[PDB]
Design a protein around this motif. Structure first.
Motif, PDB file in Angstrom:
ATOM      1  N   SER A   1       6.819 -11.450   2.140  1.00 29.15           N
ATOM      2  CA  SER A   1       7.219 -10.661   0.997  1.00 29.15           C
ATOM      3  C   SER A   1       8.710 -10.873   0.729  1.00 29.15           C
ATOM      4  CB  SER A   1       6.802  -9.208   1.219  1.00 29.15           C
ATOM      5  OG  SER A   1       5.540  -9.159   1.869  1.00 29.15           O
TER       6      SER A   1
ATOM      7  N   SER B   1       2.371  -1.745   7.224  1.00 27.42           N
ATOM      8  CA  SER B   1       1.648  -2.174   6.032  1.00 27.42           C
ATOM      9  C   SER B   1       1.153  -3.598   6.270  1.00 27.42           C
ATOM     10  CB  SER B   1       2.567  -2.117   4.817  1.00 27.42           C
ATOM     11  OG  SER B   1       2.787  -0.789   4.372  1.00 27.42           O
TER      12      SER B   1
ATOM     13  N   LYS C   1       6.898   9.960  -8.070  1.00 32.09           N
ATOM     14  CA  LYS C   1       7.469   8.675  -8.441  1.00 32.09           C
ATOM     15  C   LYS C   1       7.128   7.620  -7.399  1.00 32.09           C
ATOM     16  CE  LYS C   1      12.458   9.808  -7.170  1.00 32.09           C
ATOM     17  NZ  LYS C   1      13.682   8.933  -7.244  1.00 32.09           N
ATOM     18  N   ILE C   2       6.470   6.565  -7.877  1.00 32.54           N
ATOM     19  CA  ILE C   2       5.926   5.475  -7.085  1.00 32.54           C
ATOM     20  C   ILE C   2       6.376   4.132  -7.638  1.00 32.54           C
ATOM     21  CG2 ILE C   2       3.786   4.617  -8.080  1.00 32.54           C
ATOM     22  CD1 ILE C   2       2.500   5.388  -5.391  1.00 32.54           C
ATOM     23  N   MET C   3       6.340   3.127  -6.779  1.00 32.89           N
ATOM     24  CA  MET C   3       6.764   1.777  -7.113  1.00 32.89           C
ATOM     25  C   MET C   3       5.568   0.862  -6.945  1.00 32.89           C
ATOM     26  SD  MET C   3       9.309  -0.804  -5.358  1.00 32.89           S
ATOM     27  CE  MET C   3       7.902  -1.662  -4.644  1.00 32.89           C
ATOM     28  N   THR C   4       5.163   0.214  -8.025  1.00 33.01           N
ATOM     29  CA  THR C   4       3.892  -0.483  -8.075  1.00 33.01           C
ATOM     30  C   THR C   4       4.111  -1.985  -8.110  1.00 33.01           C
ATOM     31  OG1 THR C   4       3.719  -0.627 -10.465  1.00 33.01           O
ATOM     32  CG2 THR C   4       3.133   1.450  -9.433  1.00 33.01           C
ATOM     33  N   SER C   5       3.003  -2.717  -8.058  1.00 32.71           N
ATOM     34  CA  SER C   5       3.079  -4.160  -7.942  1.00 32.71           C
ATOM     35  C   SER C   5       1.723  -4.823  -7.990  1.00 32.71           C
ATOM     36  CB  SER C   5       3.703  -4.581  -6.624  1.00 32.71           C
ATOM     37  OG  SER C   5       2.904  -5.620  -6.077  1.00 32.71           O
ATOM     38  N   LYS C   6       1.631  -5.892  -8.760  1.00 31.61           N
ATOM     39  CA  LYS C   6       0.367  -6.552  -8.967  1.00 31.61           C
ATOM     40  C   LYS C   6       0.119  -7.643  -7.937  1.00 31.61           C
ATOM     41  CE  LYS C   6       1.491  -6.861 -13.324  1.00 31.61           C
ATOM     42  NZ  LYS C   6       1.569  -6.534 -14.779  1.00 31.61           N
ATOM     43  N   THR C   7       0.727  -7.557  -6.760  1.00 36.52           N
ATOM     44  CA  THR C   7       0.508  -8.629  -5.806  1.00 36.52           C
ATOM     45  C   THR C   7       0.547  -8.067  -4.398  1.00 36.52           C
ATOM     46  OG1 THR C   7       1.633 -10.137  -7.319  1.00 36.52           O
ATOM     47  CG2 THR C   7       1.246 -10.920  -5.106  1.00 36.52           C
ATOM     48  N   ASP C   8      -0.065  -8.802  -3.471  1.00 36.85           N
ATOM     49  CA  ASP C   8      -0.167  -8.324  -2.100  1.00 36.85           C
ATOM     50  C   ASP C   8       1.208  -8.378  -1.451  1.00 36.85           C
ATOM     51  OD1 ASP C   8      -3.428  -8.938  -0.639  1.00 36.85           O
ATOM     52  OD2 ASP C   8      -2.130  -7.172  -0.476  1.00 36.85           O
ATOM     53  N   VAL C   9       1.575  -7.309  -0.746  1.00 36.04           N
ATOM     54  CA  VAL C   9       2.857  -7.231  -0.060  1.00 36.04           C
ATOM     55  C   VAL C   9       2.642  -6.748   1.361  1.00 36.04           C
ATOM     56  CG1 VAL C   9       4.755  -5.595   0.079  1.00 36.04           C
ATOM     57  CG2 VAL C   9       4.599  -7.113  -1.839  1.00 36.04           C
ATOM     58  N   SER C  10       3.532  -7.149   2.259  1.00 33.67           N
ATOM     59  CA  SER C  10       3.396  -6.730   3.641  1.00 33.67           C
ATOM     60  C   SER C  10       4.765  -6.445   4.253  1.00 33.67           C
ATOM     61  CB  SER C  10       2.660  -7.845   4.398  1.00 33.67           C
ATOM     62  OG  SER C  10       1.865  -7.339   5.452  1.00 33.67           O
ATOM     63  N   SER C  11       4.867  -5.372   5.051  1.00 36.56           N
ATOM     64  CA  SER C  11       6.142  -4.947   5.644  1.00 36.56           C
ATOM     65  C   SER C  11       5.879  -3.879   6.703  1.00 36.56           C
ATOM     66  CB  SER C  11       7.121  -4.406   4.603  1.00 36.56           C
ATOM     67  OG  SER C  11       7.053  -2.992   4.542  1.00 36.56           O
ATOM     68  N   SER C  12       6.968  -3.400   7.318  1.00 34.28           N
ATOM     69  CA  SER C  12       6.967  -2.243   8.214  1.00 34.28           C
ATOM     70  C   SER C  12       8.181  -1.360   7.992  1.00 34.28           C
ATOM     71  CB  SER C  12       6.953  -2.628   9.688  1.00 34.28           C
ATOM     72  OG  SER C  12       5.868  -3.472   9.974  1.00 34.28           O
TER      73      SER C  12
ATOM     74  N   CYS D   1      -0.366  -2.465  -5.594  1.00 37.08           N
ATOM     75  CA  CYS D   1       0.274  -2.144  -4.327  1.00 37.08           C
ATOM     76  C   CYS D   1       1.152  -0.944  -4.695  1.00 37.08           C
ATOM     77  CB  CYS D   1       1.111  -3.300  -3.807  1.00 37.08           C
ATOM     78  SG  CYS D   1       0.478  -4.499  -2.556  1.00 37.08           S
ATOM     79  N   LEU D   2       1.018   0.157  -3.965  1.00 36.50           N
ATOM     80  CA  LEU D   2       1.844   1.339  -4.174  1.00 36.50           C
ATOM     81  C   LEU D   2       2.992   1.418  -3.194  1.00 36.50           C
ATOM     82  CD1 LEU D   2      -0.737   3.854  -5.147  1.00 36.50           C
ATOM     83  CD2 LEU D   2       0.813   2.363  -6.476  1.00 36.50           C
ATOM     84  N   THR D   3       4.088   2.032  -3.631  1.00 37.11           N
ATOM     85  CA  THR D   3       5.153   2.361  -2.696  1.00 37.11           C
ATOM     86  C   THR D   3       5.852   3.624  -3.183  1.00 37.11           C
ATOM     87  OG1 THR D   3       5.438  -0.039  -2.601  1.00 37.11           O
ATOM     88  CG2 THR D   3       6.881   1.287  -1.284  1.00 37.11           C
ATOM     89  N   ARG D   4       5.657   4.744  -2.489  1.00 39.84           N
ATOM     90  CA  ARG D   4       6.358   5.972  -2.845  1.00 39.84           C
ATOM     91  C   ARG D   4       7.860   5.739  -2.792  1.00 39.84           C
ATOM     92  NH1 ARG D   4       4.780  11.134  -0.339  1.00 39.84           N
ATOM     93  NH2 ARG D   4       5.787  11.808  -2.283  1.00 39.84           N
ATOM     94  N   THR D   5       8.609   6.284  -3.749  1.00 39.18           N
ATOM     95  CA  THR D   5      10.050   6.042  -3.737  1.00 39.18           C
ATOM     96  C   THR D   5      10.897   7.302  -3.696  1.00 39.18           C
ATOM     97  OG1 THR D   5      10.114   5.929  -6.149  1.00 39.18           O
ATOM     98  CG2 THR D   5       9.815   3.868  -4.921  1.00 39.18           C
ATOM     99  N   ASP D   6      10.295   8.457  -3.495  1.00 42.26           N
ATOM    100  CA  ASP D   6      11.049   9.683  -3.269  1.00 42.26           C
ATOM    101  C   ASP D   6      11.339   9.874  -1.779  1.00 42.26           C
ATOM    102  OD1 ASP D   6       8.234  10.056  -2.934  1.00 42.26           O
ATOM    103  OD2 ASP D   6       8.121  11.106  -4.854  1.00 42.26           O
TER     104      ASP D   6
ATOM    105  N   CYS E   1      -2.940   0.647   6.169  1.00 42.83           N
ATOM    106  CA  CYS E   1      -1.703   1.325   6.554  1.00 42.83           C
ATOM    107  C   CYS E   1      -2.005   2.075   7.831  1.00 42.83           C
ATOM    108  CB  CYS E   1      -1.176   2.321   5.518  1.00 42.83           C
ATOM    109  SG  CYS E   1       0.134   1.696   4.425  1.00 42.83           S
TER     110      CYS E   1
ATOM    111  N   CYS F   1       0.264   6.436   2.440  1.00 42.79           N
ATOM    112  CA  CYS F   1       1.003   5.551   3.316  1.00 42.79           C
ATOM    113  C   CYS F   1       2.456   5.999   3.388  1.00 42.79           C
ATOM    114  CB  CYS F   1       0.924   4.106   2.866  1.00 42.79           C
ATOM    115  SG  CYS F   1       1.610   3.090   4.157  1.00 42.79           S
TER     116      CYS F   1
ATOM    117  N   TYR G   1      -1.170  -6.391   4.977  1.00 38.63           N
ATOM    118  CA  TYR G   1      -1.998  -6.760   3.842  1.00 38.63           C
ATOM    119  C   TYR G   1      -1.916  -8.258   3.577  1.00 38.63           C
ATOM    120  CZ  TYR G   1      -2.463  -1.792   2.750  1.00 38.63           C
ATOM    121  OH  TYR G   1      -2.753  -0.452   2.809  1.00 38.63           O
TER     122      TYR G   1
END
Lengths: 73, 50, 39, 49, 73
Positions: B5, D22, D1-12, C29-34, D46, E12, D24
């Motif tokens: 990523s 995460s 409030k969320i951050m979105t994305s149309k592609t597979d992502v992976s992290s910790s 793909c979601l990521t909470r940002t608060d 997750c 998550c 994926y």
């Protein structure tokens, strides 16, 4: 020179390419101890008896050390 | 670039630069797809919402 | 022949409230940002 | 409030009392222990360690 | 143990519950003063007359104080 710049008029932004990285993912601790080269009061009288450098210089320290012993809880 | 990523460090504090070598703190980094790179070329890239 | 400075201590409005801290990670793909501390 | 994305992502993301994995996509994530070595591989999802 | 973690796969994310708080809503000021234990130069001669420790040690200070007196405006 490795590092360069690209400019995109499409977005009116500029990238700076050419960096190698190190991403911190944890901590490494180490416990360093150190000892006091302690002075023993030298008993005898000086030029001025009302002046005890060695004692005051320790109380300058002692009291500093004491003021730190009061911050940990 | 993280594994696969893309990590994004937004505050200038958490990243130290020396020479050509960056040291960043991952404590608050964001993880993005490699497709954010297509935002620089086209703002309305349909594969990522810039 | 004499130095004077102003010390500045903090005062708390409220105390002994319950607090918590939120970390978030990608969801696919979601990521909470608060992200951060709540009190 | 969320951050979105149309592609597979992976992290910790390492929390106060653990971490979040995460895992994926085609990426390969695991969790080792100092004494026991690798004690868990992660399927796509997750997980919390 | 008070502090715990809850993990939500739904979002998550991870909460850390169990903290008691203090929210700063103001300041408390105090005016601390301090006085200089001043030394009076001792007039007489030492081993080397070209060396005026007591004087130089004051000018070391004096000049520091002066350099600070230029920061307030």
């Amino acid at each position: 020179q490795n590092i360069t710049e690209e400019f995109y008029q499409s977005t009116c932004s500029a990238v700076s390419k050419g960096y190698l990285s190190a991403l911190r993912t944890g901590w490494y601790t180490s416990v360093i101890t150190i000892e006091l080269s302690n002075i023993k009061e030298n008993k005898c009288n000086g030029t001025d008896a009302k002046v005890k450098l060695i004692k005051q210089e320790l109380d300058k320290y002692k009291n500093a050390v004491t003021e730190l012993q009061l911050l940990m809880q | 670039d993280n594994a696969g990523s893309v990590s994004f460090f937004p505050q200038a504090e958490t990243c130290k630069v020396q020479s050509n070598r960056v040291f960043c703190d991952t404590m608050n980094s964001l993880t993005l797809p490699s497709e954010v790179n297509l935002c620089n070329v086209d703002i309305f890239n349909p594969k990522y919402d810039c | 022949e004499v130095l004077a400075y102003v010390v500045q201590l903090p005062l708390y409005g409220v105390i002994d409230t319950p607090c918590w801290k939120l970390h978030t990670s990608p969801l696919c793909c979601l990521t909470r940002t608060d992200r951060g501390w709540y009190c | 409030k969320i951050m979105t994305s149309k592609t597979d992502v992976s992290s910790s993301v390492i929390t106060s009392l653990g971490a979040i994995v995460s895992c994926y996509g085609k990426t390969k994530c695991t969790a080792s222990n100092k004494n026991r070595g690798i004690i868990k591989t992660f399927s796509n999802g997750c997980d919390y360690v």
